[PDB]
Design a protein around this ligand. Structure first.
Ligand SMILES: O=C(O)[C@@H]1C[C@H]2C[C@@H](Oc3cccc(Cl)c3-c3nnn[nH]3)CC[C@H]2CN1
Ligand SMILES: O=C(O)[C@@H]1C[C@H]2C[C@@H](Oc3cccc(Cl)c3-c3nnn[nH]3)CC[C@H]2CN1
Lengths: 258, 258
C-alpha cells in the first residue's frame, strides 16, 4: 500500500546499476533489465508495496541545466511529473536538491584515482608533485568540476596541470579514460564506485589512495513527494538487514585477483 | 531568514564534536562550548540565518526506547518539541527515523577495528580466523548490536567468539575498551570516526582494515520540521565548498607519528 496505480520509474543504462538483460528469447517490460538498481527497486517494492514500470529517460541524461535554468534528463522527468521515482546512480547535489527530492543515500562514495598496480604512487599529492605520470578526468564531468572549483592547495595544483594539457590530460568520455589508463602511463580521477567495479575485472589496475570528496546516490522523487521519506526508511531497513552490502557484493565481485 | 525565533539546539558532550571550553574566566551561553558540532551550527546559521541556543540534553543520552516503549535523550527532546534541532554525532537509524526526521548526513563512517600498530593483522577476517588475539565491543553498544544481528559468515563467527567469551571480549564502556587495547592483546570494534580521533593522538594504535558497515550522523529535527530540508541543503553546500573537509581536519588532525 503506497498508491492505487503503477508507479513510473525513470532510469538510465549504467553498468552494473541498470543493464540490458541477456536472453535467448525476447523479453518485455521490466524483465528487460537487471542490475543493482533493479534489485534495489524490487526490494523497495517488496517493503513499500508498490507495482512499477521502468522507463529509460528519453534523452539518456542524468540531469543538468542550461544558462536559462532548463533542466534535462531524469531530474527533468521528475520536475515535470512524468516519473514518480528515479532509481539510478543519481548523485545527491546541492543544485538538484533545490528542484527535486532525494531519499537518503543508498550508496556513499567519492572521487578517487584509477592507476596501474605496484607503483610508488599512494595519493593525489604524489601525482601533484610530479609530471612524468599524466592524470586527468572526463572533460566537463562531475570529477573535472570538483577540481576546477577547489580551493585546496593540492587540488588547485592538480587542476593547473589538468588545464594546461586540455587535450593530453582530459578525456572526451569515460571509455577513452579507461583505454588511456590501460594504454599509457595515465591516472584517471573518477567515481570510486566505478573504480571498484573496474579493479575487480582488471587485475593490473588499482585504486590509489582514499576518497578525495564525499557524495552519495539517492532515489530521486518530485519535490514534495510522500514516497521520499518512505523510501528513506526502506533504504535504512535494507542497510540494517545487510542487504545493501549483499547487493553491492553481488554486482561488484569479480572472480579474483592474486 | 530561516526562523524569527531563536532555535533551541539539544546536544551532548562527545569529544571532539561538543566540548566544554577550557577558559580561566567564566563563560556564558553558547560560548561555553566548542567543537565540530559548534562549528557546524555556526556554518549552518551563516547560510540559513537563524539564531540558536545550545542546551545539553538533561539525561545525557542520544536516544533509545525502554521496555515501556518510551523514548529518552535528544530523540525524546525532539519528539516532545523541547528542541528544534539536535546537532550531535546522532546516528541516522531506521528506529529513530520512525519517530523523528533527519537531515542528510554531515558525516559518514562505519564500524572498524582499533588495535596496536605494526602487527600482521589487516582485517576482520584475520581476527575471525584466530583466538590468540582477543577482540570485542562495548556491551549493548551500537557495535555489539550489529554483530549480534549479522548474517554475514565472518561477522556471525566473530559474534560467536564474542558471546561465548563475553567476560573478557565484551567491555562495560569505551574507556574500559581503550584500556584493554593499551594493556592487553585486544582489538576493539568501534565507530571509525572515534578510531581516527584516537589514532591521531596515540601513535601506538592504528585502525585495522576498512569499514565493516556504513552509517551517517545527521541533524535531527521533530517530524515535519521545515528546517530539515533547509539543513540538508546547507550541509550539501558546505561539502561542495570543502568546509566539511576543513572542519573534520581542524578537529581530528593530530601532530603526527614517526
Ligand atoms: O549523478 C551523476 O551525474 C552521476 C552519473 C553517473 C556518473 C558515472 O560516472 C562515471 C561512471 C563510470 C565510470 C566513470 Cl570513470 C565515471 C566518472 N565520471 N566522472 N568521474 N568518473 C558514475 C556513476 C553515476 C554517478 N552519478
Ligand atoms: O546516535 C548514536 O547513538 C551514536 C552515539 C555516539 C556513539 C559514539 O560511539 C563511540 C564514540 C567514541 C568512542 C567509542 Cl568507543 C564509541 C563506540 N563505538 N562503539 N561502541 N562505542 C560515537 C558518537 C556517537 C555516535 N552516534
Amino acid at each position: 500500500s503506497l498508491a492505487n496505480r503503477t508507479l513510473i520509474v525513470t532510469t538510465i543504462l549504467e553498468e552494473p546499476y541498470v543493464m540490458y538483460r541477456k536472453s535467448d528469447k525476447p523479453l518485455y517490460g521490466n524483465d528487460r533489465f537487471e542490475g543493482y538498481c533493479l534489485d534495489l527497486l524490487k526490494e523497495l517494492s517488496n517493503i513499500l508495496g508498490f507495482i512499477y514500470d521502468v522507463k529509460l529517460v528519453p534523452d539518456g541524461k542524468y540531469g543538468a541545466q542550461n544558462d536559462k535554468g532548463e533542466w534535462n534528463g531524469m531530474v527533468k522527468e521528475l520536475i515535470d511529473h512524468r516519473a514518480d521515482l528515479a532509481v539510478a546512480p543519481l548523485t545527491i547535489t546541492y543544485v538538484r536538491e533545490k528542484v527535486i527530492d532525494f531519499s537518503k543515500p543508498f550508496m556513499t562514495l567519492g572521487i578517487s584515482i584509477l592507476y596501474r598496480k605496484g607503483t610508488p604512487i599512494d595519493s593525489a599529492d604524489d601525482l601533484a608533485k610530479q609530471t612524468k605520470i599524466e592524470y586527468g578526468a572526463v572533460r566537463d564531468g562531475s570529477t573535472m568540476t570538483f577540481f576546477k572549483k577547489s580551493k585546496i592547495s593540492t587540488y588547485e595544483k592538480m587542476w593547473a596541470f589538468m588545464s594546461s594539457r586540455q587535450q593530453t590530460a582530459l578525456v572526451r568520455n569515460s571509455d577513452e579514460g579507461i583505454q588511456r589508463v590501460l594504454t599509457t602511463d595515465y591516472a584517471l580521477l573518477m567515481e570510486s564506485t566505478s573504480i571498484e567495479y573496474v579493479t575487480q575485472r582488471n587485475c593490473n589496475l588499482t585504486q590509489i589512495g582514499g576518497l578525495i570528496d564525499s557524495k552519495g546516490y539517492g532515489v530521486g522523487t518530485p519535490i514534495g513527494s510522500p514516497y521520499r521519506d518512505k523510501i528513506t526508511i526502506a533504504i535504512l531497513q535494507l542497510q540494517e538487514e545487510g542487504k545493501l552490502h549483499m547487493m553491492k557484493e553481488k554486482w561488484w565481485r569479480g572472480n579474483g585477483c592474486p
